[PDB]
């Protein structure tokens, strides 16, 4: 039994709900929140934005020091670092970003990423901003995900489709 409330189970490991992913995290306190990262760790806008701005700002100065000793992260790569004040780590997760022309096939690559986390609260990765289709997103975090995943999605109208749609 875990703290997460709320949610549509839609598989043996995978849940969903319409929730905003930072007020989720500031409830919960999930061992693992995924950000939707790029690979400079830059967070102006979307679900990084959003949990960045939730820091206060101090996700992003971390971030700065881990790609000033690291360097960028791989598109389907990713890091652990700080939770800060949403979670105990923040799992950084780079999906493709399709108006930027990267491959899709990397979106598998990414969610690969879960596996090493027994439970997550996330995104789905690549949408949003990011471009790729939620509902193909949500097929490869089935599809790849083997690890309990508690998925939030802002948009309501989106959860709807999602749900409606799932096979
Ligand atoms: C498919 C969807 N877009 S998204 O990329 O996952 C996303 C973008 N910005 C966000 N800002 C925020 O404050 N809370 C969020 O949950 C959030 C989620 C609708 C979820």
Same mark, same amino acid.
């Given at each position: 039994? $875990?703290?997460? %409330? ?49 820091? $206060? ?18 598109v ?5 670092? %700080?939770? +800060?004040?949403?979670?105990? +780590?923040?799992? +950084?997760?780079?999906?493709?970003n399709? $108006? ?20 997550? !609260?996330?995104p ?11 509902? +193909? %997103? ?5 599809? =790849?995900?083997? =690890? ?8 309501? $109208? !989106?959860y ?5 749609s799932?096979?």
């Open positions: 039994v $875990n703290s997460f %409330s709320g949610y549509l189970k839609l598989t043996d490991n995978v849940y969903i709900k319409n929730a905003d992913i930072v007020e989720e995290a500031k409830k919960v306190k999930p061992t693992v929140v995924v950000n939707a990262a790029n690979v400079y760790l830059k967070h102006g806008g979307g679900v990084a934005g959003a949990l960045n701005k939730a820091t $206060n700002n101090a996700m992003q100065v971390e971030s700065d020091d881990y790609i000033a000793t690291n360097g960028p992260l791989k389907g790569g990713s890091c652990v670092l %700080s939770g +800060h004040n949403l979670a105990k +780590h923040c799992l +950084h997760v780079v999906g493709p399709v $108006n930027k022309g990267e491959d899709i096939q990397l979106l598998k690559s990414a969610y690969e990423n879960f596996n090493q986390h027994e439970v997550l !609260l996330a789905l990765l690549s949408a949003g901003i990011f471009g790729a289709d939620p509902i +193909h %997103s949500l097929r490869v975090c089935v599809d =790849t995900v083997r =690890t309990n995943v508690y998925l939030a999605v802002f948009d309501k $109208n !989106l709807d489709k999602l749900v409606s799932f096979l």
